[PDB]
Amino acid sequence: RGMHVPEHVAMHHTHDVGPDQCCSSVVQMIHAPPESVWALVRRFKVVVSGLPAVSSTERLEILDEERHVISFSVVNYRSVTTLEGTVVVESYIVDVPPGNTEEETLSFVDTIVRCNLQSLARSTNR
Amino acid sequence: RGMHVPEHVAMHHTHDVGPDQCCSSVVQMIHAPPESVWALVRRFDNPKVYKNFIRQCRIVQLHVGDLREVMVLPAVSSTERLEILDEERHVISFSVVGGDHRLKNYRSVTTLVVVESYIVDVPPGNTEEETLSFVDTIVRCNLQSLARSTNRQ
């Protein structure tokens, strides 16, 4: 967006759009210290079942302990995650393969992140 | 929370866990008044108010006995009722009669002590350590989504 401190969020959360490629931002912050949050955002659970099958092909491309950055990816995703307490932004990338529209998908890959960075705040109250 | 909590968590939750009919609770706590909590949640018209992964939803000619047409990827679509809309003792329950989807019998009791009880005809022709975990997580996200939208935190 142009956050409070988009500084390590810069090169990362900056993703290239495309003709089929997409991406978006988030608002979820925590008041427990940041390194106490990183703690949990470092140990690779949050398929979720539902549909008959469930596949993924994930991979780590960035790991930064000193400044706090872990970039997920697929084998298209390219999730990036950043940080009196702490902030936690979010962004990713994706595909609209014939079958839907961005206002279902990026709102199908949107709604989950809140339910993933919301899971993180409970575990570090405030 | 605690043990003086049956006030309306008796005549509801004390409920028929039959043979293939499972259920489970939900630890959640919000710093707004239960009245402030209730308004956000009361809204059965739009479940979107706070409930996740939903899509557009209508009704039938909100009320007690008036059906709705919520819908959620590939395919699946949910059709519910509102057996109980108790507005004084914060309680909503609603069954998914006339649904399109797999997961069978339902009566999602959301009472406020803030707890959501779910029931699922134990079999979707599948496991049981998954039927609970598939939904109980779905449940999880929503009440967590309930919390956010009111200034609990």
Author numbering:
A (entry chain C): 37 to 80, 84 to 85, 111 to 139, 147 to 154, 160 to 202
B (entry chain A): 37 to 97, 101 to 111, 115 to 154, 163 to 203
Can I see the authors' text?
A 13-member family of ABA receptors PYR/PYL/RCAR (PYLs) in Arabidopsis thaliana was genetically and biochemically identified. Upon binding (+)-ABA, dimeric PYLs underwent a pronounced conformational rearrangement, and then bound and inhibited the group A protein phosphatases type 2Cs (PP2C), including ABI1, ABI2, HAB1 and PP2CA. PYLs/PP2C heterodimer blocked substrates binding to PP2Cs, and thus released downstream transcription factors SnRK2 kinases formerly inhibited by PP2C. Structural analysis along with biochemical data in vitro demonstrated that steric hindrance and hydrophobic interaction in the pocket of PYLs were crucial for their stereospecificity to ABA enantiomers.
